[PDB]
Design a protein around this ligand. Structure first.
Ligand SMILES: O=c1ccn([C@H]2C[C@H](O)[C@@H](CNC(c3ccccc3)c3ccccc3)O2)c(=O)[nH]1
Ligand SMILES: O=c1ccn([C@H]2C[C@H](O)[C@@H](CNC(c3ccccc3)c3ccccc3)O2)c(=O)[nH]1
Ligand SMILES: O=c1ccn([C@H]2C[C@H](O)[C@@H](CNC(c3ccccc3)c3ccccc3)O2)c(=O)[nH]1
Lengths: 153, 135, 151
């Protein structure tokens, strides 16, 4: 599976240009926390990840009664387990047509505020097939304004 | 992936007659979830999933296993799916149930027509469905 | 999907030789020793096994049998307990050689006793295809694979 990722700021672009934990073969792509943020105790926070993405896979014939955009998954990283933060929707399902910012809905199970920091890695993108992932940085996902493409401001 | 769905009452049939990687499932009856609880919420349907046969390593159409995901909008409630993602094995013929944890210190009211969970294929392929009398 | 499983003790080998729970999409994994989980805690519970998953090679877009990634799911029956899988679903990458661990949140205000033979989690293929398994002594020639020259 190949991800095309639009970074929503120069700061975010710099993070993904120097991605330090992605290796050839990996089934998950770590995503960064992109801004220091305080998560309220016993709360759900919709944490913006500063990127938009599409996933590309080979077309397949499927029962329903070359390369195509496909749905993909947002998993917690195993290392989230040492924190009090949990993914509210368990596993995120990003449909093939979504052009919005990728968000992690994080439950803070602690009675204390939780500080997340730029460069923390709490979630990862994954293919439905679990196949190795590649990615590249692009300026737009498609021609639409939500896709960050097309004419004008 | 194609689902054949048995609705377990005419009220439920009505909901699915008047109903993409996930197929939203409805809460089919108003219900109060106790504070700090797990409730097995019955969804009033049985279902089998059909996909093309594949050669797999071990040791035309087949019924296959499928998944029960939370909807992303569950996040806006205090309810969480207890078993994370439900696995419905190919052999299952029972009613589909969502095990919902109410993390609130107060009771939570779910209503008929609420959509908290969805059925998903292992491949994330588009889903179709039809209503049947029998699996 | 076919799993090659290394059991890390004879006690664990005894369990998997006599499985009893296993065309199924999930392979149940055992709790392998009695353990007490503290209240309001996350415990990294060691499952006493290492495992590689094998599938037929498939062509994938990226810019005969192979090692493949696989998943650690809670069992549906975990729902009746106060235990929850901290990371939702575990992702085990192709060829991973460490002991498989279940990170379990005890959401109770009471300590929770897990017991040898309890089944709380299961291994699952990304395709949901039936699973087979066999017991092996090593995954590869490396010490982390439990193989190769000893001492
Ligand atoms: O885990 C997910 C799952 C889906 N989506 C995409 C596809 C979905 O179509 C979209 C839903 N946005 C919701 C929202 C709800 C739960 C988790 C994330 C996002 C939302 C955004 C901002 C505030 C409050 C809720 O996000 C996502 O970004 N992350
Ligand atoms: O999330 C799931 C996972 C599996 N199943 C199917 C296939 C599994 O083989 C089966 C387990 N049924 C149990 C049960 C226990 C926990 C969560 C859901 C369901 C049950 C049966 C009767 C009453 C109340 C609960 O349900 C399901 O309906 N939902
Ligand atoms: O649920 C999972 C997911 C991945 N892994 C494998 C593949 C992952 O690559 C690996 C992550 N190991 C971590 C760890 C952290 C949380 C939960 C489990 C495992 C670890 C354990 C003990 C000490 C230090 C770290 O475990 C696993 O054993 N169980």
């Amino acid at each position: 599976m190949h991800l095309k990722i639009v970074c929503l700021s120069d700061e975010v672009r710099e993070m993904y240009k120097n991605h330090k934990t992605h290796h050839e073969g990996d089934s998950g792509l770590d995503l960064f926390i992109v801004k220091d943020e305080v998560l309220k105790p016993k709360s759900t926070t919709f944490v913006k990840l500063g990127i938009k993405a599409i996933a590309l896979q080979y077309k397949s014939n499927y029962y329903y009664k070359n390369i195509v955009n496909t749905s993909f998954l947002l998993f917690p990283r195993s290392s989230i387990s040492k924190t009090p933060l949990r993914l509210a929707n368990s596993i995120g399902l990003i449909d093939a047509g979504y052009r919005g910012e990728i968000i992690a809905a994080l439950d803070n199970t602690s009675d204390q505020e939780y500080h997340i920091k730029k460069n923390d890695k709490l979630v990862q993108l994954v293919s439905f097939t679990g196949e190795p992932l590649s990615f590249e940085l692009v300026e737009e996902l498609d021609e639409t304004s939500r896709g960050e493409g097309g004419f004008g401001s």
